[PDB]
């Protein structure tokens, strides 16, 4: 996920990620982990694999 | 008074539908629409209590 | 009825242990094992009340 949308992975939220891509259930019982991946995904030309 | 204790005690009860009881609103749909579900289930729980 | 009214009042008082009262569970050990103290104290407060 682009970092400006990392808060969109949450139950009961509305967004382009939160509606058109995927939705979390309101009764979701689990955990969410995020990590920086600039040294593994960010390229000078640009990563078109996502 | 047998009439007057029965007309009053309903009118006290019915007007108790207008109270907030510490919640943000006495209207159910305002809590359902203006809040997240986990917080709406707390405010509506306060209203129900 | 004197036999019945003291039998329906107790059994109901048993069945109201199955109520959640807005908490995440009606079993206190599940709340104390799944959540830390500050989070679980609100749920235990709701159940106790």
Curated annotation (Swiss-Prot), chain A:
Residues 2-4 are annotated as: Integrin-binding motif. It comes from the Viruses. Binds to host ACE2. RBD also interacts with the N-linked glycan on 'Asn-90' of ACE2. Cleavage of S generates a polybasic C-terminal sequence on S1 that binds to host Neuropilin-1 (NRP1) and Neuropilin-2 (NRP2) receptors. Interacts with host integrin alpha-5/beta-1 (ITGA5:ITGB1) and with ACE2 in complex with integrin alpha-5/beta-1 (ITGA5:ITGB1). May interact via cytoplasmic c-terminus with M protein. May interact (via N-terminus) with host bilirubin and biliverdin, thereby preventing antibody binding to the SARS-CoV-2 spike NTD via an allosteric mechanism. Attaches the virion to the cell membrane by interacting with host receptor, initiating the infection. The major receptor is host ACE2. When S2/S2' has been cleaved, binding to the receptor triggers direct fusion at the cell membrane. When S2/S2' has not been cleaved, binding to the receptor results in internalization of the virus by endocytosis using host TFRC and GRM2 and leading to fusion of the virion membrane with the host endosomal membrane. Alternatively, may use NRP1/NRP2 and integrin as entry receptors. This is Spike protein S1. It comes from Severe acute respiratory syndrome coronavirus 2 (2019-nCoV). The chain holds residues 402 to 451 of 1273 of the full protein.
From Swiss-Prot, chains B, C:
It comes from the Viruses. This is Spike protein S2'. It comes from Severe acute respiratory syndrome coronavirus 2 (2019-nCoV). Subunit of the fusion protein that is processed upon entry into the host cell. Mediates fusion of the virion and cellular membranes by functioning as a class I viral fusion protein. Contains a viral fusion peptide that is unmasked after S2 cleavage. This cleavage can occur at the cell membrane by host TMPRSS2 or during endocytosis by host CSTL. In either case, this triggers an extensive and irreversible conformational change that leads to fusion of the viral envelope with the cellular cytoplasmic membrane, releasing viral genomic RNA into the host cell cytoplasm. Residues 1-44 form a coiled coil. The lineage of its organism: Viruses, Riboviria, Orthornavirae, Pisuviricota, Pisoniviricetes.
């Amino acid at each position: 996920i682009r970092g400006d949308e990392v808060r969109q992975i949450a139950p009961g939220q509305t967004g382009n990620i939160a509606d058109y891509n995927y939705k979390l259930p309101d009764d979701f019982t689990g955990c969410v982990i995020a990590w920086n991946s600039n040294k593994l995904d960010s390229k000078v030309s640009g990563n078109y694999n996502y | 008074d047998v009439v007057n204790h029965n007309a009053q005690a309903l009118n006290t009860l019915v007007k108790q539908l207008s109270s907030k009881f510490g919640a943000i609103s006495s209207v159910l749909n305002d809590i359902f629409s203006r809040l997240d579900k986990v917080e709406a289930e707390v405010q509506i729980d306060r209203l129900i209590t």
